[PDB]
Amino acid sequence: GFIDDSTLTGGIYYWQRERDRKDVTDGDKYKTNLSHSTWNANLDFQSGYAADMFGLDIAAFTAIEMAENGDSSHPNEIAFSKSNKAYDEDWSGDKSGISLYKAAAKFKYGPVWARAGYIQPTGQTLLAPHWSFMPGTYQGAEAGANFDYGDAGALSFSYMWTNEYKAPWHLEMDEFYQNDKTTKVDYLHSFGAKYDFKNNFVLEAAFGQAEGYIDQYFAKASYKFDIAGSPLTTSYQFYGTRDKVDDRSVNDLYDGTAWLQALTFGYRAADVVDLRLEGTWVKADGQQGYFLQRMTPTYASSNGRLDIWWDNRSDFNANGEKAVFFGAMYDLKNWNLPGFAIGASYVYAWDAKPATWQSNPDAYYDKNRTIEESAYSLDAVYTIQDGRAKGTMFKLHFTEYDNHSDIPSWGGGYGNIFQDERDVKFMVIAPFTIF
Numbered sequence: 001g002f003i004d005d006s007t008l009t010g011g012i013y014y015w016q017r018e019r020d021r022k023d024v025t026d027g028d029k030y031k032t033n034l035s036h037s038t039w040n041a042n043l044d045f046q047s048g049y050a051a052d053m054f055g056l057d058i059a060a061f062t063a064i065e066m067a068e069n070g071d072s073s074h075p076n077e078i079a080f081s082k083s084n085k086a087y088d089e090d091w092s093g094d095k096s097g098i099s100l101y102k103a104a105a106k107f108k109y110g111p112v113w114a115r116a117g118y119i120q121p122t123g124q125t126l127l128a129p130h131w132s133f134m135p136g137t138y139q140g141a142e143a144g145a146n147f148d149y150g151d152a153g154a155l156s157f158s159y160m161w162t163n164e165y166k167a168p169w170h171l172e173m174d175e176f177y178q179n180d181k182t183t184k185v186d187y188l189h190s191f192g193a194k195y196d197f198k199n200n201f202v203l204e205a206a207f208g209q210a211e212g213y214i215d216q217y218f219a220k221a222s223y224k225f226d227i228a229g230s231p232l233t234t235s236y237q238f239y240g241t242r243d244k245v246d247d248r249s250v251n252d253l254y255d256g257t258a259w260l261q262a263l264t265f266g267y268r269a270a271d272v273v274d275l276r277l278e279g280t281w282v283k284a285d286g287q288q289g290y291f292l293q294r295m296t297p298t299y300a301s302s303n304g305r306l307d308i309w310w311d312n313r314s315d316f317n318a319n320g321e322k323a324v325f326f327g328a329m330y331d332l333k334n335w336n337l338p339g340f341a342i343g344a345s346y347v348y349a350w351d352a353k354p355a356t357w358q359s360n361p362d363a364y365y366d367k368n369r370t371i372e373e374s375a376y377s378l379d380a381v382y383t384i385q386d387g388r389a390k391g392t393m394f395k396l397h398f399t400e401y402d403n404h405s406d407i408p409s410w411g412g413g414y415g416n417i418f419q420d421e422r423d424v425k426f427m428v429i430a431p432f433t434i435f
């Protein structure tokens, strides 16, 4: 029951990074952009259900700075921002702290479930937290249902409503606003569904809104089949967004519907190497000039579901842009190094356009330009196989990112693109169980 089925788990985390970026307004100096060493640690209590109907979850984490270079930018998203509320953010520093990231009543009744309080989305909608080591947190509620039809498939759906949020690098919640940071968005809500036909074919879709401002869409089809005894997995994904401000004010983001479509393939070869081939295509006409999967435009103010992630620094999400990604991860078990893996990946993207109009354009703004970007990354991972520290993981990731233009960072009507970088991340993740 509620006591007997309780669990208490957590982890200790270590992160060290060095990233530099080209300033094409001072020669082309690769200047320090991030340089810090930071710890996290968390405790997560999840109760059982009294009478199979009522429970409680409570979880908290701390972040402790260890080193930071004076030229490191802020916030680094592993420590806490010195600005506790997202809409106060002024980019001037980072700090240590303790955050309550889960605190919720949970309910079950037949096929129905619900959660309320300080929560993460967990069902079928398109709301989502940001993830660092730990997730961001919404103030609100979600309810959903699950119906199993045996071999004929299974249906799930849910609805969530929220009026405040905090990213994992913010110690306090803030409300929602339009692009101007002052016109109120009273709530975000979303409804979605999933149908699993139990033949490896699965459909998902969802709709969301930011009150008075943005309508958001999500749809995904996936399928897998065996090729030579091993599954090839495929998916088609659609993300869309439309706004309700088209007067050419600061709050006017998109002309028409903006969207991102994607195709993915995955396959494990010779039972030893995981291969990925993926591509994306974006349309984002209007003042902003890039696609967002979240329903509020300001950095850190909320997040939305996005199943595409290439860990190659850029978002590759500019108006018109096409991108293709290839990744390989090689399991070294047959060299008798079980738990050891090495990888490499590459991206090439073309046809990236800027915003279609600008109110105070800069020297470099050219409505009809197109640009390109590319990147490649290397990866090394080791997970402890047995003993006291079984499952503790060490990871090293290197990216080299190349902007194929001379436009300075964030300039030219390309408001989400920055300049060439080199990035190195080292992390350690050490989970534990108390009971």
Ligand SMILES: CCCCCCCCOCCOCCOCCOCCO
Pocket: 205, 206, 207, 217, 218, 219, 238, 240, 257
């Ligand atoms: C201009 C709309 C484009 C939508 C693209 C297709 C996305 C497929 O999934 C969307 C599922 O959403 C269902 C719509 O929900 C109701 C919308 O109407 C509500 C008020 O306008």
Ligand SMILES: [Mg+2]
Pocket: 230, 268, 269, 270, 271, 272
């Ligand atoms: Mg295989």
Ligand SMILES: [Mg+2]
Pocket: 272, 334, 335
């Ligand atoms: Mg081999």
Ligand SMILES: [Mg+2]
Pocket: 402, 403, 404, 405, 420
């Ligand atoms: Mg370059």
